[PDB]
Design a protein around this ligand. Structure first.
Ligand SMILES: *[C@@H]1O[C@H](CO)[C@@H](O[C@@H]2O[C@H](CO)[C@@H](O[C@@H]3O[C@H](CO)[C@@H](O)[C@H](O)[C@@H]3O)[C@H](O)[C@H]2NC(C)=O)[C@H](O)[C@H]1NC(C)=O
Ligand SMILES: *[C@@H]1O[C@H](CO)[C@@H](O[C@@H]2O[C@H](CO)[C@@H](O[C@@H]3O[C@H](CO)[C@@H](O)[C@H](O)[C@@H]3O)[C@H](O)[C@H]2NC(C)=O)[C@H](O)[C@H]1NC(C)=O
Ligand SMILES: *[C@@H]1O[C@H](CO)[C@@H](O[C@@H]2O[C@H](CO)[C@@H](O[C@@H]3O[C@H](CO)[C@@H](O)[C@H](O)[C@@H]3O)[C@H](O)[C@H]2NC(C)=O)[C@H](O)[C@H]1NC(C)=O
Ligand SMILES: CN1CCC[C@H]1c1cccnc1
Lengths: 382, 387, 383, 384, 383
């Protein structure tokens, strides 16, 4: 009949281990439970849903008194392994579960020693909820907590305490996107409430930007740099409007990509997002100015007339400021003079057209410096 | 063990199928109160709100009581919830899954029979959505609680306080709760005969516009204001339809997105889904003008003739009101030269008509530019007047 | 002990009430199971998945005989609520569930009188499967059903009857998307096999068009109306190909939108889906004729020659159909004569060039009527 | 209570153990008769190679302990004992892709006084299948369902087939597949004397209605549109839009097709091979259009025309292509002579420009036939 | 019968919580074996592997034994697994879900006491991945098994053979298995003392390059070919911007797709990402150059004046390297003026024609650079 059989009988038999009574010799004795967390693998961190998945080993070690025996009558066995369904448990569970299930499944054995010590280390995979800060999206460091509190009990019955100030990580399989900085833990008890005891561990994780710094930022920088080339195209080519609209769409493509990674923001817009709106506003201003320049270029003396102030401010003052500079003989005579006069008139109106074109060219260069200087000040700010 | 003896004596002869009332034809009082923990999400496409709550029941009992003196001064026990009678309070307006709440947390007996039960519960209720002003809206969703089988003469439901207990709330990021009041009513259903009581808790969440303004409304204004730019482009530039097509495609994409972000209810018209329809209508009407004004620019004296009714209207009358006021051997040599002169004169005469056609096209473009600016400035102050 | 406590014990323990035996006395005895379904909330109707979600109440009410007593021996008690899983129940379940949910919902209390007339009213939310017809997409009308049948027993054992020929609308919260016309209910029994009885409730729901006739119908018509403008362009702007392809792409967008709310079909397609295909085919033919017209426009006598047939059939006859009306002196003389002759030849060549410009306009105008007549004729055929 | 007593006798007094095979001898196999009944066909998703179906499996064996003397208790002939009270053969599916290794719901058993037992539980299965997508519109499939016992072997179980077909009487007609056959086979391997199972080879033929008007006609329309570029003039300025648009449309079509059907390294759909050909031809069209545009714009002041170019593109090629080739007096004299010479030089330059333009036109026409013949030659192995 | 009596006697007195050893200081040998059925899904973005297996636990008891000379020679029995002692073997690297596996399947005993439990299981394990050569890659994924409570002094695992059984395997269309060896380790942890044994099975797989060499590589090569053409188009065509910007947009779309296809690991840089970044940078450079040649092309003596070093380099040395190579007085006063106007026009036209040749030389210089560098970069970087 072995010896373990008599041990388990005398433990969970006629002595009638009740399984639902808190172990307490007196009416005021408090059961002290010592906790210790061992991180094993940081599975993933989801910014869109703000849910972190972890693989942790939580060890709980209280001290019972009904499970004790003399290690001489029952051969020489002093360590047992009782299933976690016939022994009282403190019922310590996670209090910030993402889905909202304050329940756990018990199938792992205990380890009961001879003097009453009880060790329980159940495997668990947790999906907690934590705040995600995305001010600097590629280079960010997060702070996500784990909160462990009792479920069926409160204070004046249990004394949840910390074994080690940190959470030992001596099983870690290193991740590929996040780096562990520190894992401290603290025990909070509210003096304004005699029925509140808490133990919490918080994870500080720093990202490793190499994938995003290559698949983003740099293409955005190139597309932004492409936005200043429109102010250099000639008006006769007739592709200015083709260039402006295409740049806006390309910037739209990147904005959709970024907004599908960060969660719906409330007040902390990422710094890589505020840049794109500024660039889009500048590009829209560029489109409007390009339309105005195109209208100015296509002018003729038969439809428009140049005001005297235009030829004084836009032709002789501004260009110096932008560093730029520029019997039948009677009938025969009548007809040839008519031809000469027609040629002179054609030359005059052609010269006026050239003046209009140069005025448009001068106007175009003015906005190239404004765009350059207003762009650098916007980048300096944010 | 004193506690074991008390537990054995209390539950020696007990069944949970009988009401805890002592004398028959008497109602057992049940005090009810909920408390919110976290509002997960408020879906708008399906009109479903999911919430995490903590129901609280405090009722009475007569057979679960004992004298503390006879024992070691015990005035509190913890029994499983699957061994005592519990009222059946359900969520009337469920949307998915089952109706019965998740109850496994142990009760809390007192020495005078005062049971307390606080089980967790996850609810996915259904409430109609109001999209008259899709941004800056105020939703009003309610939760209904009541006993399914016990009538008003048996369970006699009561309420504690008048507000949902918000002390452990985990604050959200997109919605703000400003009112969580609750009231009690009595109903008499058609299928039943007796009166039945309810307790309804209604939320008054308010949206926080940061995502649906800078990413939905602000980019739309640029497209809306970029439609008028077409009428300032010269006809000879060669890019008068790329702008119109781009604007139309952008508006189409915007319509598609807003349609696939809003519930399909057809009781009221949103103030953005009709504004964007109006903008699309006037964008479509803008392309028609451009084609009808690009055609008048390329007319030639040898293909079309300008009638007098156009000359007296589009050339002299209309431009004044637009501040665009109108701005042997010698014989053969003579024979040859005269021919050259007449050719030049004919060329000049044709060029005059071509220039007149171009000016008429310009006048039409300016008139439509003014009309579109005047209308579009009004538009915004109307469909988007009070959002 | 309490009156209910004593009644329950002396009813469920002394007689050893076993909830496995049918309460029928005769071997070939049928037990009528009256039904009455009351609607409470029409949650949603799914198009792609063809599943409908509702909130309904059943009112199964048979008449057991073993559950009877006197209203004087056991105090004045006449109604006694009992848990559901303690009395025999005819397992009536939804027989066309979307998935393998051939079960019931949570078990509430039963109402048993002194007469034995049990009353069961369980709350349940059903997601049944129904066929969807999308011919008149914004103005369609669906007929989705709910089939209730026995789970363990069959005929000659149960006799499911209908209490009223109408599903009541007690505690109904009106919807905002789907209307309701009628809720008929019928009893079906197979004449050949006398072991098949079922009760089916038919839901007739009619849509309320105001969200789709503003966001899909009007924009589609507006975009379709842009397919004619290609034939009014002057053909000299260099922008005759940026319009037709753009219209094609916009129609592609609008067709994409429609192909999502429509289930994968093999028997019927919405009339809008047939209109868009017609418009797209017309646009493709417009692209082809625009290419041909552009090729005709750019011609000159130094590359091509005009045959007499086109000259006399596209410049006189066809335009009238469409109402479209149209010795130093010796050397000096030699040089001036050369200049004049060059001018004359240039003028003649330019005049010949201008003829090729008119035939392009005539061809473009001819195809304006062809595409306008076909589209109008095609629209009549659909509706 | 006679029926209640009869139920008691056969389950408690006789001690009907639920874990004992109803065999009298040491080698008496339990003969199981299996009959599969079809209800409906749901999905044949080819992206993950699974099929969903709903069936009822009818089984019938015999017991010797479940017999009672009729007309002795009350005259009853049929009982309705629940399923989990009588020994069951545990017949399950051995190719499911979800781990579903049993029936859906355990219904009630029907047992007669003869000892026979009839069980008809409804089950929902997600079987695995191989998809041969090479004629994607007109494709015929063959998927199998394997039924085996995961508790007993041919030494104590003798599964047999009732009829060599599946029962289809409540079969709701499918909307996008058509049944052609439903055979059933029992396989016994002589090498392994403990292997017995039955298999129901589903055979389904597709109905090409959705994927013949909305998928193929637009494709051939775009392929026929891809040739139009060779007919546009080089002065219009819209030659580089049509080709790019056609290429991007073809690419989108290819992506959508690859989303609908996952072409793996076992077979490529015949519609997935034609789009590659069309895209390659369109790219070559883009290249040759760039070449012809460069040839068209060639002034005599930047380029020189070699005699071989003339003799090959203005005298030889147009024949086969069926084209056609259509005091102060002295000072006054000096000035007019200068004007005349300037005009003559301008005329010569214009003539050279026209020659270059005609050479570009001739080059454009030649590739119209080459792309038309290669399209015909290609579309005999990639589509036939 | 005799079987019922044997079952009753065998399982009348059985403690299912006691180790089946007879001496407390003795290990219980447990054999382990793994058989795979199918390879369902290999997730790359989430780095999760899903498989269906047939675990095989076989050990020996000491009290569930009998002799087949009394009970008619019965040598085998079947009992549900819920009433016997079974060792706890769990998957250490479970990604999602719980760790419990099975227990419905009944164990098979013998007259010696040997149990042959064989429960089905489905596991979702974690597997880090390397995406160096994404289209042509080999992945190494492993499963870790071991006892969670008993150490090497109670339960000592033993491995059967060295490979996963593949007798019943359904071949995967995308992945092919190469090696499936397994090994045993004796590891000691830092949380708790004592040594613990484990058995790990490693699956070696190789992708089949047909889906991603067709839908991704081929269009990428086509687009990377299309970019060099913009240096052969004439500047008078007016369609260079369309071509280059189309190429850029196509590359951007490809970038987005590739980003949302492969996992975001920051250890090594994938080859495809490097090639795409290089191609995008080169395409961006080409657009910048295109604007400058267009600006140079449209330059006239009225606006811009040509320097000398421009004439010294271009049109002189660079093209050679790239192998490009009475009333009579008034009549005179009237005719003359005309001739002087013509001479001035000719000079202006010549000066204009000088600017057009510079734009041709610059475009030819950048044609050779792109072909020289792009062909070597693609050949070298992509191996
Ligand atoms: C919608 O929001 C409003 C307020 O935010 C609430 O609806 C109405 O709330 C008032 C309370 O201010 C209710 O009046 C109450 O009625 C009881 C009935 O016995 C009576 O004693 C008092 O007159 C008391 O003020 C009113 O009934 C209620 N009406 C409705 C239709 O709800 C509520 O929070 C939200 N309701 C819904 C349905 O969303
Ligand atoms: C046994 O005794 C009762 C005592 O009244 C008899 O009355 C019937 O009881 C049913 C309950 O099953 C009641 O039905 C009622 O019908 C009305 C009219 O439709 C409805 O408004 C009520 O809500 C309720 O459903 C009612 O008290 C009465 N039935 C009728 C038609 O009057 C009962 O008939 C006796 N049973 C037998 C088998 O004799
Ligand atoms: C033991 O008794 C049962 C009845 O208690 C008998 O099995 C079958 O019983 C009915 C009595 O008419 C018959 O079933 C038949 O099923 C076929 C299935 O296709 C159907 O087509 C027939 O119309 C009929 O309903 C059948 O006569 C009878 N079976 C036989 C072989 O006679 C039978 O006496 C015994 N069963 C066995 C398995 O030995
Ligand atoms: C009070 N309930 C509300 C819905 C049905 C009604 C009811 C009445 C009697 C028995 N069960 C339910």
């Amino acid at each position: 009949a072995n010896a373990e059989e008599k041990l388990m009988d005398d433990l969970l038999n006629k002595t009638r281990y009740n399984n639902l009574i808190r172990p307490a010799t007196s009416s005021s004795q408090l059961i002290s439970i010592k906790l210790q967390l061992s991180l094993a693998q940081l599975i993933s961190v989801n910014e869109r849903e703000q849910i972190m998945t972890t693989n942790v080993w939580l060890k709980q070690e209280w001290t019972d008194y009904r499970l004790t025996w003399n290690s001489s009558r029952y051969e020489g066995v002093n360590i047992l392994r009782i299933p976690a369904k016939r022994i009282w448990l403190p019922d310590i569970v996670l209090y910030n579960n993402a889905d909202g299930t304050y329940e756990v499944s018990v199938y792992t054995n205990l380890i009961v020693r001879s003097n009453g010590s009880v060790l329980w280390l159940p495997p668990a995979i947790y999906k907690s909820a934590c705040k995600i800060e995305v001010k600097y999206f590629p280079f960010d460091q997060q702070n996500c907590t784990l909160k462990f509190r009792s479920w069926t009990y409160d204070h004046t019955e249990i004394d949840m305490v910390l074994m080690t100030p940190t959470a030992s990580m001596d099983d870690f399989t290193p991740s590929g996107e996040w780096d562990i900085v520190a894992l401290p833990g603290r025990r909070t008890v509210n003096p304004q409430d005699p029925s509140y005891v808490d133990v919490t561990y918080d994870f500080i994780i720093k990202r490793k930007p190499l994938f995003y710094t290559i698949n983003l930022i740099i293409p955005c920088v190139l597309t932004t740099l492409l936005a200043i080339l429109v102010f250099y195209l000639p008006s006769d080519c007739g592709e200015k409007m083709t260039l402006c609209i295409s740049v806006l769409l390309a910037l739209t493509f990147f904005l959709l990509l970024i907004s599908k990674i960060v969660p719906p923001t409330s007040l902390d817009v990422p710094l890589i997002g505020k840049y794109l709106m500024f660039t889009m506003v500048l590009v829209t201003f560029s489109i409007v100015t390009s339309v105005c320049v195109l209208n100015v270029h296509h002018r003729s003396p038969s439809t428009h007339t140049m005001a005297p102030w235009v030829k004084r401010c836009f032709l002789h003052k501004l260009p110096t400021f932008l560093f730029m500079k520029r019997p039948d003989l009677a009938e025969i005579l009548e007809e040839v003079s008519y031809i000469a006069n027609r040629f002179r008139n054609q030359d005059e109106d052609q010269s006026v057209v050239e003046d209009w074109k140069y005025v448009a060219m001068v106007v175009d260069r003015l906005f190239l410096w404004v765009f350059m200087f207003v762009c650098v000040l916007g980048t300096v700010g944010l | 063990a004193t506690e074991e003896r008390l537990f054995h004596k209390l539950f020696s002869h007990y069944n949970q199928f009988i009401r805890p009332v002592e004398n028959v034809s008497d109602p057992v009082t049940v005090h009810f109160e909920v408390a919110i923990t976290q509002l997960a999400n408020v879906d708008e496409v399906n009109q479903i709100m999911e919430t995490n709550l903590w129901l609280r029941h405090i009722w009475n009992d007569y057979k679960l009581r004992w004298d503390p003196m006879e024992y070691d001064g015990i005035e509190t026990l913890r029994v499983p919830a699957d061994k005592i009678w519990k009222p059946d309070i359900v969520l009337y307006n469920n949307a998915v899954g089952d109706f019965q709440v998740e109850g496994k947390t142990k009760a809390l007996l007192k020495y005078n029979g005062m049971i307390t039960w606080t089980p967790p519960a996850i609810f996915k209720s259904s409430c109609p959505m109001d999209i008259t002003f899709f941004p800056f809206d105020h939703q009003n969703c309610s939760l209904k609680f009541g006993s399914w089988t016990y009538d008003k003469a048996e369970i006699d439901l009561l309420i504690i306080g008048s507000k949902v207990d918000m002390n452990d709330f985990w604050e959200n990021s997109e919605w703000e709760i400003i009112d969580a009041s609750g009231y009690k009513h009595d109903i008499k259903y058609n299928c039943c005969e007796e009166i039945y009581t309810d307790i309804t808790y209604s939320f008054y969440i308010r949206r926080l516009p940061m995502f649906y303004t800078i990413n939905l409304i602000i980019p739309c204004l640029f497209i809306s204001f970029l439609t008028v730019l077409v009428f300032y482009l010269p006809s000879d530039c060669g890019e008068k339809v790329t702008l119109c097509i781009s604007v139309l495609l952008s508006l189409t994409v915007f319509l598609l997105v807003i349609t696939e972000t809003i519930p399909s209810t057809s009781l009221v018209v949103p103030l953005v889904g009709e504004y964007l329809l109006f903008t699309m209508i006037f964008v479509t009407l803008s392309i028609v003008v451009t084609v009808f004004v690009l055609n008048i620019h390329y007319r030639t004296p040898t293909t079309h003739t300008m009638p007098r009714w156009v000359k007296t209207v589009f050339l002299k009358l209309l431009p004044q009101v637009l501040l665009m006021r109108w701005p042997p051997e010698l014989a053969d040599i003579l024979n040859e030269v005269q021919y050259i002169a007449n050719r030049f004169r004919s060329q000049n005469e044709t060029k005059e008509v071509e220039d007149d056609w171009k000016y008429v096209a310009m006048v039409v473009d300016r008139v439509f530019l003014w009309v579109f600016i005047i209308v579009c400035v009004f538009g915004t102050a109307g469909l988007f007047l009070q959002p």
